[PDB]
């Protein structure tokens, strides 16, 4: 059976399981079950399933080189799918809540969930809660007797936490740290002294890399009982490097990809986000250019946004981007080589993850 169709079958299974359990144990009625079904589909489906499918991919790599009964190959692949959906549902949680937090309008060419007329923020915040609660319901049900249950739950838990810490780093990235104070409304930075490479790296490391690259890789190892085929410090490094690159692309796109293609009208300039463009701009701008940036960044006014965009074009940031990209290629290749020593198989799965990121 092909991987994607397995993964999709498992979604239907897990959905039926969750909703049947709501009826049998949580006294749900059919209309609220239907609400929850449509919520799950709307918030969890229609992406590429990169994250979830990486768990499957890593597991399939191990299957090709490890002796097992047929029934065992099926159980490991089922487990990789369940694990993958846990990650997809965890992403869904974060997208729901993030869209609410940021006042976002569209996601993937459709309205954000909270903007559906029969949802509202009042419901959507709780829907997002339920999304994440479902990951735990899946794990305890499907992995109950599994030897990896504890390590998988513990991993999941620390990635979830890292992610929430990252969202805090992200939403506070345009304030001056020394002025954070729950009692005082927060001004936007005027000096941009915290728009640095190291600060940027911290945001991206926590907000995206743990759930997008580390969790799918390591879940794949855990469902395969293969976490001793690898040096976990090397897996973390490679996950953090690739994930950083991913976000650097995401930041460039937010500014320069046409809305209809991006699935989104990008607002990072208006939201005064610590983006890779802003940091790299401030890394090479002269005094005049910096002053112009400060007078126009983080403002709704489309004239001001078009000034900041003009500044970025004339700063030849694509040349800085090529250069970053070259360095990441080289470092990713070095880490893959290091991984080849213990597991050529796992190294190849990392190679695939990198090709998919690097090409998209």
Known binding residues for Mg(2+) = 98, 102, 170, 250, 254
Is the CB of 8 or the CB of 162 nearer to a copy of itself?
162
Q: Would you tell me how many other CB atoms lie within 10 Å of the CB of residue 140?
A: 11
- Which string of x and - marks every residue 11-50 that binds a copy of itself (by CB under 8 A)? -----------x---xxxx-xx-xxx-xx--x--------
| Residue 297 and residue 308 in contact, taking contact as beta carbons nearer than 8 Å | yes
**Binding flag, residue 323, ligand LV1 (CB under 6 A):** yes
CB of 198 to ligand LV1, least distance (A): 8
d(CA 302, CA 107): 21
Which residues are documented as binding site? 98, 102, 170, 236, 250, 254, 268
Number of H helices, E strands in the chain: 15, 2
CB of 267 to a copy of itself, least distance (A): 13
Is the CB of 57 or the CB of 280 nearer to ligand LV1?
280
Q: What residues line the site for Zn ion (CB under 5 A)? A: 98, 102, 250, 254
Is the CB of 79 or the CB of 98 nearer to Zn ion?
98
**Binding flag, residue 167, a copy of itself (CB under 8 A):** yes
| Residue 346 and residue 354 in contact, taking contact as beta carbons nearer than 8 Å | no
Q: Which of 77, 90, 100, 347 binds a copy of itself (CB under 8 A)?
A: 100
Coil, helix or strand for 194?
coil
CB of 200 to ligand LV1, least distance (A): 3
**Binding flag, residue 196, a copy of itself (CB under 8 A):** no
d(CA 343, CA 229): 6
Q: Which does 45 bind (CB under 5 to 8 A by kind): Zn ion, ligand LV1, a copy of itself, none?
A: none
Is the CB of 93 or the CB of 273 nearer to ligand LV1?
273
CB of 343 to ligand LV1, least distance (A): 28
Is the CB of 237 or the CB of 340 nearer to a copy of itself?
237
- Among left, alpha and beta (phi > 0; psi -120 to 50; other), residue 298 is left
Which residues are documented as binding site for Mn(2+)? 98, 102, 170, 250, 254
Contacts of 125 (CB under 8 A, 6+ apart): 97, 100, 114
- Which string of x and - marks every residue 194-213 that binds ligand LV1 (by CB under 6 A)? ---x--xx------------
How far from the centroid of its chain's Cα atoms is residue 300's Cα?
A: 27
**Binding flag, residue 330, ligand LV1 (CB under 6 A):** no
| Residue 230 and residue 221 in contact, taking contact as beta carbons nearer than 8 Å | yes
Sign of the alpha-carbon dihedral angle for 159, 347, 233, 149 = positive
3-state DSSP helix/strand/coil % of the chain, to nearest 5: 75, 0, 25
Nearest to 339 by CA among 61, 13, 63, 18: 61
| Residue 131 and residue 43 in contact, taking contact as beta carbons nearer than 8 Å | yes
Coil, helix or strand for 301?
coil
Q: Which positions touch ligand LV1 (CB under 6 A)?
A: 197, 200-201, 276, 279-280, 323-324, 327
Residues of this chain that bind a copy of itself (CB under 8 A): 22, 26-29, 31-32, 34-36, 38-39, 42, 97, 100-103, 116-119, 121-123, 125-127, 129-130, 133, 136-137, 140, 150, 153-154, 157-158, 160-162, 164-165, 167-169, 171-172, 177-178, 180-186, 202, 205-206
């Amino acid at each position: 059976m092909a991987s994607m169709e397995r993964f999709l079958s498992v979604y239907d299974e897990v959905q039926a399981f969750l909703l049947d359990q709501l009826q049998s144990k949580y006294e749900i009625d059919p209309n609220r079950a239907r609400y929850l079904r449509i919520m799950m589909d709307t918030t969890c489906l229609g992406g590429k399933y990169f994250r979830g499918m990486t768990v499957v991919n890593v597991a399939e790599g191990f299957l090709a080189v490890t002796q097992h009964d047929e029934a065992t190959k099926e159980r490991i692949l089922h487990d990789a799918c369940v694990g993958g959906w846990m990650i997809e549902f965890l992403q869904a949680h974060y997208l729901v809540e993030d869209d609410i937090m940021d006042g976002s309008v569209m996601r993937r060419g459709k309205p954000c969930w909270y903007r559906f007329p029969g949802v509202t923020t009042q419901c959507a915040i709780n829907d997002g809660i339920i999304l994440k609660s479902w990951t735990q319901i899946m794990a305890w049900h499907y992995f109950a007797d599994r030897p990896f249950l504890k390590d998988l739950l513990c991993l999941f838990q620390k990635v979830d936490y890292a992610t929430a810490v990252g969202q805090m780093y992200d939403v506070t990235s345009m304030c001056d740290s020394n002025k954070l104070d729950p009692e005082v409304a927060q001004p936007m930075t005027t000096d941009f002294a915290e728009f640095t490479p190291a600060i940027y790296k911290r945001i991206v490391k926590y907000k995206t890399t743990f759930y997008t690259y580390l969790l799918p890789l390591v879940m794949g190892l855990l469902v395969s009982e293969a976490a001793a085929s690898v040096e976990m410090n090397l897996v973390e490094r490679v996950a953090h490097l690739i994930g950083e690159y991913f976000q650097v692309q995401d930041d460039v796109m937010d500014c320069f990809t046409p809305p209809e293609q991006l699935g989104k009208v990008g607002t990072d300039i208006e939201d005064a986000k610590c983006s890779w463009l802003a940091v790299t701009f401030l890394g090479k701008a002269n005094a005049a250019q910096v002053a112009e940036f400060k007078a126009n960044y983080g403002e709704k006014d489309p004239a001001k946004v078009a000034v900041v965009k003009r500044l970025y074009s004339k700063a030849n940031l694509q040349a800085d981007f090529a250069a970053y990209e070259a360095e990441v290629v080289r470092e990713v290749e070095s880490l893959i080589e290091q991984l080849k020593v213990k597991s050529p198989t796992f190294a190849e799965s990392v190679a695939v993850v990198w090709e998919k990121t690097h090409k998209r």
